[PDB]
Design a protein around this ligand. Structure first.
Ligand SMILES: N[C@@H](CCC(=O)O)C(=O)O
Lengths: 94, 61
């Protein structure tokens, strides 16, 4: 139910497995400390480095709309409608 | 709709997002019996779980 949002001129979506598949009762259970959190912080770190780069897109600021898949394909597909509901618009998906 | 199992599965993945019922008439794949994934799909034909039994029993005879 949560989404990470950062303002910008062009918005790039993201999809990461922050949570392990909980099971029948719950879709999302415990957190991935290595493949869930570190990878997302890596994407944020790259975005920060680009946004203070003068040689790469000096006048355009990139936003972000990052979602969570909970290591399940049905859950991931339900979340992915945010990318296509516009047609804020999403330029590309990491 | 849905004559080939592949077409039915692909269409079912999309229709469950908008809550639209679907009834098939020729799709006999067994994968469609898992209601945790295809929770809006029905059909008037049996699955392929019994056709294998029939074929195997024909060979044994
Ligand atoms: N039952 C076949 C379809 C064949 C037919 O149209 O009779 C299938 O699942 O591909």
């Amino acid at each position: 139910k949560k989404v990470l949002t950062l303002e910008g001129d062009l918005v790039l979506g993201g999809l990461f497995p922050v949570h392990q598949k909980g099971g029948p009762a719950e879709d999302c259970g415990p957190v991935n400390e290595h493949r869930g959190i570190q990878r997302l912080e890596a994407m944020l770190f790259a975005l920060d480095r680009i946004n203070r780069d003068p040689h790469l897109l000096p006048g355009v600021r990139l936003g972000a709309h990052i979602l969570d898949s909970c290591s399940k394909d049905t859950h991931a597909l339900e979340q992915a409608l945010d990318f296509v509901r516009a047609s804020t618009a999403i330029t590309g998906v990491i | 709709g849905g004559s080939y199992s592949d077409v039915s599965i692909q269409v079912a993945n999309l229709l469950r997002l908008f809550q639209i019922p679907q009834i098939s008439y020729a799709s006999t794949s067994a994968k469609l019996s898992d209601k945790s994934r295809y929770d809006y799909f029905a059909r008037t034909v049996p699955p392929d779980f019994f056709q294998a039994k029939a074929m195997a029993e024909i060979l044994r005879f």
